[PDB]
């Protein structure tokens, strides 16, 4: 997260860290046994870390649970990043409490102008590299589809939306991928891609979760 603020320990209780020996992507807990993330975060050997603030220090509220199954969306396209969503099943159910909690799926899509919360442990600089150890937060609005398509000609599908600031300075970034965009208490986006980070006229692009609710619910029901 570039240009954000320190969330505070366990104030984003649905945020997860995907660990393969190190943090490499975010995700969101959607019930006691399932996480949603970005398909471009796919790899084998994932451990899901819940209840994290400082990902390099054991602070006492963590739960570490290995993945038993990962399901990349059937139509994921790694070249365009269309359908950049995957589901991860945990080997055992998480213990839900005030600091580890699921985020509701949306019943309706969010409109441009809605303010959302984006969070992650990704890079905090637009030029250079500095990775934080505590969770960072950003409040950002959903941008109009017209402005999104104008920023990224020929690259925005109906399964994507832009959020952030056309003036630059505030954005998600590398290492935030897979993490949540929460608007009015519902999961509306997944950190997916962008051109650099926090650059003028290049806002972040997010997977549009409301398009996938039926697939998520059907998949969870049968796996
Ligand atoms: Ca920790």
Question: Domain-by-domain residue ranges, the chain?
Answer: 1-12+103-210, 13-102+211-222
Q: What angle do CA 8, 46, 61 make, to 5 degrees?
A: 30
* 10 CA to centre of ligand 1 in angstroms: 10
Determine whether 177 is an active site residue.
yes
Helix (H) or strand (E) holding 88: strand 86-90
Backbone angles phi, psi at 187, to 5 degrees: -75, 110
Q: What angle do CA 70, 116, 187 make, to 5 degrees?
A: 30
Phi-psi domain of 96 (left: phi exceeds 0; alpha: psi -120 through 50; beta: other): beta
DSSP 3-state of 196: coil
Fold assignment, 13-102+211-222: Thrombin, subunit H (2.40.10)
State the method. neutron
Q: Are 202 and 196 in contact (CB under 8 A)?
A: yes
Q: Show the tokens assigned to 198.
A: 């926090």
DSSP string for residues in 138-185: EEEEBPPHHHHHHHSTTT--TTEEEES-TT-S-B--TT-TT-EEEETT
- Catalytic residue (one of 17, 28, 84, 176): 84
* 114 CA to centre of ligand 1 in angstroms: 32
Determine whether 84 is an active site residue.
yes
Which residues, listed in sequence order, are joined to residue 48 by a DSSP beta bridge? 18, 65
Q: Are 104 and 217 in contact (CB under 8 A)?
A: no
Q: Show the tokens assigned to 173.
A: 């970034």
* 28 CA to centre of ligand 1 in angstroms: 17
- Catalytic residue (one of 40, 53, 102, 176): 40
List the shell of residues around ion ligand 1, using CB closer than 5 Å. Answer: 52, 54, 59
* 75 CA to centre of ligand 1 in angstroms: 35
Task: Write out the binding residues for substrate.
Answer: 171-172, 174-175, 177
């Amino acid at each position: 997260i570039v240009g954000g603020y320190t969330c505070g320990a366990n104030t984003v209780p649905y945020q997860v860290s995907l660990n393969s020996g190190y943090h490499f992507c975010g995700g969101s807990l959607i019930n006691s046994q399932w996480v949603v993330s970005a398909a471009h975060c796919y790899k084998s050997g994932i451990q899901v870390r819940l209840g994290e603030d400082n990902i390099n220090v054991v602070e006492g509220n963590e739960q570490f649970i290995s993945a038993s199954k990962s399901i990349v969306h059937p139509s994921y396209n790694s070249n365009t990043l269309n359908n950049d969503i995957m589901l991860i099943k945990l080997k055992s159910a998480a213990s839900l409490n005030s600091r580890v909690a699921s985020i509701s799926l949306p019943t309706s899509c969010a409109s441009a102008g809605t303010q959302c919360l984006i969070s992650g442990w990704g890079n905090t600089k637009s030029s250079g590299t500095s990775y934080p150890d505590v969770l960072k937060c950003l409040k950002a609005p959903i941008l109009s589809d017209s402005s999104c398509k104008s920023a990224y000609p020929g690259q925005i599908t109906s399964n994507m939306f832009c959020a952030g600031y056309l003036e630059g300075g505030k954005d998600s970034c590398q290492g935030d991928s897979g993490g949540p965009v929460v608007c009015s208490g519902k999961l509306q986006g997944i950190v997916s891609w962008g051109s650099g980070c926090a650059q003028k006229n290049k806002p972040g692009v997010y997977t549009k979760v409301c398009n996938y609710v039926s697939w998520i619910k059907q998949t969870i029901a049968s796996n």
